[model samples]
Target: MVKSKIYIDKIYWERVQLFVEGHSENLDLEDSNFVLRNLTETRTMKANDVKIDGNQFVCRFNVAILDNGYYLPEDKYLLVNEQELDYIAQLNPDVINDAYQNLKPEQEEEYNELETQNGKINFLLQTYLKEFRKKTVYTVTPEISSDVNEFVLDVVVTT
Candidate 1:
């Protein structure tokens, strides 16, 4: 295997330096291999959520093969993992936070109060549909009623 140089930001380097200096007297923060190993471990753990490369951060998704020789998603849709959830949060923090905030038990009381009114239910549903359209950015092409056994998903990634 080929070896490559990996570097960390000054802030992370300083934190590692302070940790080693306070813990072990033999450990040298100035040593390149020691610093590289520390940063490598940190990077590996961070990659589970978001990877930091030099100064920039990135997210990755792994598509693995199955023993039955079929793709992982045998259905029409694929589920998002924790890493994907983190990436989505990075994309729109306000929308994600607001969604959770709205679902809180305290908010349920207000929802129930509004539900007591007759025409207010329609108004509430329309408000929810409008909010959903504002937050989501996609269209269902070919309709979602296609047969699951023969469905083929083609995904396009964009900003």
Candidate 2:
């Protein structure tokens, strides 16, 4: 067997990345993928509708795949974990905060509702994945817009 020439940067790492939008608004944020062996997911085209931030949200998703075979979306697409879900809901508040660091009670109420909605969706998806996988921790973190972002995924295999 050929030993793969790769270095493990972090203990939980298989891959990490941030997805930003170009011409489209949706499908901008996605988790990084780390597959095992020669297997990889198909780069299917997704429009801007399949996002939680609605059409106007310029959101981004961070990805970290544990391993190649470990990824469920191999050769396919899957919804991001729950953190992003809730993040999008609370996103309005974040936007408001960016605009005016202080938020009005009315805006807070509305923002809380949306945040809860977003969190509910995220939690639901996470619960589903939990029931399906029963193992592996999934979470999300947002990042600012950046160019020259590396798209090539880093993966590892253990025998």
Candidate 3:
């Protein structure tokens, strides 16, 4: 594993496709269930057009959630190819040999297990946002002005 990859799923976050610039994407959520104060507004929005297609969700909603792709550095950390990543995640062999000189095996197992469970949503968000405080995207559209320019976005998932 050259770099650690991150994945965030829509199971906990339903706003991946509804991401708003600098605001809407920053969610205050509970892992538990709740009722919306207003409407999910889901019924009115064109939900089908932006389908939550993958287990991974990425949006530039005010902060970093999982992305389809993040440009990672250091020859490792936060890069993935689903086909290849799938192969690697599956190949977590029982008979293992790896270095963790300062870490305990039990904690390592527990941490990895926890990450596997939720797809590392919180950890990645906190880590990247705090550690680097920056990320980049191509034609990253947060807003528009069609009249101010009237840009109802037609965007692709992060690539």
Candidate 4:
């Protein structure tokens, strides 16, 4: 089969919408589960009226998670707590490739076989978040405020 563009399903976006909307404020999860914690109260971002159109979700949490105590020069939409970053890292292809490299061919094959399973969640999250920008009809009048908001949570969660 010829390689081609991958399409995301609308139903996948629905789950993301549910997760984002119903995300727990107790996102103040384990100390080791994140690179940092940004919540002054609940660890999750303060919520506002948001919507999902296609792959996007409207969010008022116009913040980002700084990596290694600094902002990433690449994608800046990654505003989240340690949990989110840890979650993303787990789904990265590099992590998948490397983790399986040293294993037997069968094991590697197994990993490859399961790669789609691991990838689906990350793909959905990235796609949904990307689409989130498109669905927002309202814009912050003067933009919202952000602080140097540096709070680190020394946690490690592996899946």
* CA lDDT scores, all candidates in order: 0.24, 0.28, 0.23, 0.27
lDDT (Cα) of model 4: 0.27
**lDDT of candidate 1 over 76-128, digit per residue (tens):** 22111122111111112232234334565765566556644433433232222
lDDT of prediction 3: 0.23
Candidate no. 4 TM-score = 0.21
TM for every model, in the order presented, reads 0.17, 0.19, 0.15, 0.21
Residue 28, candidate 4: Cα error in Å is 12
- Could you give the C-alpha RMSD of every candidate to the true structure, in order shown? 18.4, 16.7, 18.8, 16.9
For candidate 4, lDDT tens digit of each residue in 39-137?
A: 242233332334444323333322222233322113122224233434211122332233334466664454455456535333223222222232332
Q: Residues 1-159, candidate 2, lDDT per residue (tens digit)?
A: 332112211111123433332221233334322222211333422222323332232223233333332332332232222222311121212322332334457644644565565453332222212111224443332221123221222222222
Q: Which order, best to worst by lDDT?
A: 2, 4, 1, 3
- Candidate 2 regions exceeding 4 Å error are 1-133, 145-159
Across 34-106, the per-residue lDDT of candidate 3 in tens digits comes to: 1111011221111122222232223322212223243221111211113222211111211122212223666
> Which clashing pairs does model 1 show?
none
Best-performing candidate as measured by TM-score: 4
Backbone N/Cα/C clashes per model: 0, 9, 12, 8
